[PDB]
Amino acid sequence: APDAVFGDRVRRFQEFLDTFTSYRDSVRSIQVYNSNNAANYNLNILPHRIIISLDDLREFDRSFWSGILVEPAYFIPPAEKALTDLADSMDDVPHPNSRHPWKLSFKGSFGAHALSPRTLTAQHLNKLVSVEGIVTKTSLVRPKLIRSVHYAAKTGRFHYRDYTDATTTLTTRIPTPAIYPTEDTEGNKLTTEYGYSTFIDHQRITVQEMPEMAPAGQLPRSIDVILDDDLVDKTKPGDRVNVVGVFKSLGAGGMNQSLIGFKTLILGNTVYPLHARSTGVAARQMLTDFDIRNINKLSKKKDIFDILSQSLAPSIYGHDHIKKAILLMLMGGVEKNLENGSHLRGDINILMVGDPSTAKSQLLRFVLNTASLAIATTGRGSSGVGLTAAVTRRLEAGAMVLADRGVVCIDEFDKMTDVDRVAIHEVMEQQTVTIAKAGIHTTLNARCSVIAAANPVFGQYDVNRDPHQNIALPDSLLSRFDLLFVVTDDINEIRDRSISEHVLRTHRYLPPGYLEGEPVRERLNLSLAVDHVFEKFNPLLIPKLVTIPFLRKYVQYAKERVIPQLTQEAINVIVKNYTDLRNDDNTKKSPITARTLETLIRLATAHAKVRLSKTVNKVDAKVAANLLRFALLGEDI
């Protein structure tokens, strides 16, 4: 039976949708997208879901906003009905072959409802809450029968029955346990018609307080979240997540005479995978047309490589070719997948062996902070079980499996066991992890670029000795590292005063919105995995330095929209340089193998990607070989 208050709220939300035109634009775009590939194929179908900004709702109608936040069961169904009515009103051109219920998702500032699994108590029940946590368990995506269609052969007629549970609606119904129809009303045997029955995907994930904010030494708190038909498979275990949903109570909690307390869970409305450092979530960024224009504008510059090289770690003094190599690894080459099935690696590995305090770990931490997807590990702090996969009858991804299509920053690389070393041997060239353990023969993808830091045998790189004795690493392992940089802390007066002036200038830095003696606050930077190009603060005083967010945008653009093709004019340089490096006797820091030809190719491709060029020209090969010759010998030609 119709409710006057329900209709009043429906028309109020219709007024809200009319006021903010972005929601008709979103619904219209979704409908035209669905119709266009429906007619095209007689890709994927976008869900009937709209992101609603709670700030705009508060601006429009504060009580509707407070009603949704505090009494969602009475305000969300009317708003969803209004959205569905609006969508069916604009649906003048129906999809080929009210109706099509549209769901709502919420975003914005939740205030006191933005909680965690620890702070989510029983006085938040029946409220729209945003819970931030870590996904620890993801159940199987199971179909749920919401409508069963049967066939009666004697009458030749198709019947159906709709099913309802306590979690499909925000309000409580009268429970109607309608049985599965095994026969008609008048005795005819029914045959279930699979493919005409309706099954809805259902998942139940567990969100636990994030380790970065959970109290140390205390047992963590968890909360159940239920996802239905479009939020399933939106996250994976170990993901940082922000789930917006209604904190519901279900069952009777032992009152109904046939539990210790009422069964509580979150009916998920929105799932946002969050980006935290050293996690398995990549960093999607929004690239406006202005950002792309600036990226192309800077790519037109000749010295853009240098501009990108110095802007990586201005705080670190020097380490300029190391920064060039780090930028090239951030871009990386393009992997080759030949038709027969073979794989050519397109990821660049870097090793930095050096004396104490030459900033190898700060250069690792910077890469961890700025990379799209980076996992930080330490030698012997993570084993092969912790680096590669692990069998739990089920597999748990390790450091280098979560970092697939990403970067692995390994500090204290020398303090790594040989059992880990063999797994690392497999991961670096073939980019795969073969388990073959306890009846689980699986080949996980570990297409990751490894950057590592190491110390010499005696703790100080002796220039009198040779590198092979100063490294104490297997030669086969050192071959996998595309670029091996030996950094030595030479005491020279010019660079001594220059590095000290830099260190002090960096220490004498103030944020734009801070006082002289105000302790700088620090948050954990839980970015959402979806305004000037250059940097005001320049530790060096000189070319221009771009901001780290803009550098990340540039790296993302070049990494996702540029796939350079090798050219003969680059091949001549690459082949000549490889032949010289193989045959010339120079007492190289690292050996020269066919892997050296491919690090030449990969670095040339990466530098071509830096310039946004779709073809690797001669200059790219020359600069790649230049960096390689520096890395092998120390030349400055």
Binding site: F158, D165, A166, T167, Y194, D201, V422, E426, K437, H441
Partner: protein, 683 residues
Amino acid sequence: SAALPSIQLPVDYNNLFNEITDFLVTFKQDKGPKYMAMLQKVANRELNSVIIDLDDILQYQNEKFLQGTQADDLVSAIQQNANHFTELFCRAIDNNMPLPTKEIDYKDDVLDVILNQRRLRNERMLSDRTNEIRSENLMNDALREVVEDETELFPPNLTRRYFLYFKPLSQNCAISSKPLSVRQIKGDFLGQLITVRGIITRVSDVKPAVEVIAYTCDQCGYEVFQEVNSRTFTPLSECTSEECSQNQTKGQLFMSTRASKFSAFQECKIQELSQQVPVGHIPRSLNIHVNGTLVRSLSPGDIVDVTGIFLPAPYTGFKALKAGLLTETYLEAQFVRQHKKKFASFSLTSDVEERVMELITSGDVYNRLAKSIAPEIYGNLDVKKALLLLLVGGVDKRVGDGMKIRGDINVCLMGDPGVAKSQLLKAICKISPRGVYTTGKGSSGVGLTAAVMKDPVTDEMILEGGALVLADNGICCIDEFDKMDESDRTAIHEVMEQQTISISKAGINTTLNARTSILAAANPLYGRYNPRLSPLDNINLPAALLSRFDILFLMLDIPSRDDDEKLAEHVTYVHMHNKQPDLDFTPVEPSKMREYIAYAKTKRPVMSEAVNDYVVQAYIRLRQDSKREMDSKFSFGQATPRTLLGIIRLSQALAKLRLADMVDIDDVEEALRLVRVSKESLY
């Protein structure tokens, strides 16, 4: 009526059944109709499985359209709802079932004679109703229609000996055949005929799953049949036939296993391929329910396209986590396509023959096949020749005393870094239908053994094999051979000599069969070859592990000007264009190489006196040469009777590659040449 409302669907099953019957009777484009030929074969009991091609149905519909007749889309209806059309096609076949031209004899199956008996019994009961009503004297159409109302006959599913399967319509000959990942199979695809591409990870034993359990009643003499649909069933206690139900003294009825309907049941587990899993995800598995004659067509490690009806099952998880009518899902397998056809299932059909002659007539089969193994790897021709010989393998000899000779070639590639030993291992794994790539000191400690567990489907303790067991009658490519545990090394020793793994541990005492060819890749002592040091010194293989390998290559990376120039041109061409540089030489497609090697493995060449005399002389000269250099800085470990059998195995493999039955002098020449050049890279 108000409850259980009726819905109007665009599916009319009466004319769909009529179209099914017309297609079965009239389709002949693949001397007469293809399907009645198949039903005639089934009637005479040469065939127990009916595979309905969706390509045939699509072609029939296209022909009907071309002649102007409007035909309902049977293919789309089958794809959308496949469970009903198995039921439909079975009824249609039963209607058009030809009479058998062969009488029942004593060499027929017990099921066949049971079905014949019940068919004759039901026809006799029809005739008996008819005669009784005629004697009662109360048109033959009405008489018949009364008879089938007063008869309790055996239903057609009890007089049914064949199994029905739906082969998906080919992509080139085109929804049910486009391969889907395990993730891509959502609940929208439930109830449809879909194809999933994956790798099989666990197959259960073929068990008898009851479908229609039969009982006999000693009171009324009836046979009461109860259909079984779920995991568990409750047996009947009192008879439910007409006589006992009408009477007051009911009869207690006993099970009849021979009269019950059983199905060969397997529950396989398919898994996502590495190319299908998204970034940072763990592959998820899917349950495949294999029934009927389709069993034993899936084995662990198989990369297959499995086409079946995606069907729901009752929930089996925790009851407290059930929110609604949650259902488990499985794939009722209907068709299996093997990406890598097994060497055992090779048949010399016409198309296989034409391809083999087009390979042979091109000439230079040995070198073409060797150079086609990883064609982007450059300049390892003796290496690729030895790998091809390993793929073909020698001729297994069982002496009458019960002795067995291995017949399989183990090849060890010890070399410097960056020489493509690991790339050659994955090439062999790709070529081999049963190839297992493992890395030493990874997680293969249990891999080079089998682990005893419980089968979840069937309440048994079964030991699931690992790397050396899953690669049985195949190839195990072991990378980083010099970095395994002692137990793994001993297991490799046993596998390479006796082709078995003897396990005597707490809970198990078995001798596993591992007929595996071992292709090992190793790094020399210190990771780089020191030519100053002795070859045996730089080889970290016990004289007994080294002895087992039929060939041991020493792939050394010496710098040069022309050789390095040529490798770099090849690698850089491969990087520009995803293909090898040479235009004169065209590599053999890996599927056509597997077919040639499968054909070659069917030959068992023998050695004559004139060839084995030279084999003896060469063995003597090799032994003398090995004796003359025991520590001369070029010692490879002295020759052994194992080198003679390796020479013999290589000669037999080379003879097989020629598709010959005589082991000729050319093959022994090439075997000696390969053994000699296995070690010339040192010089």
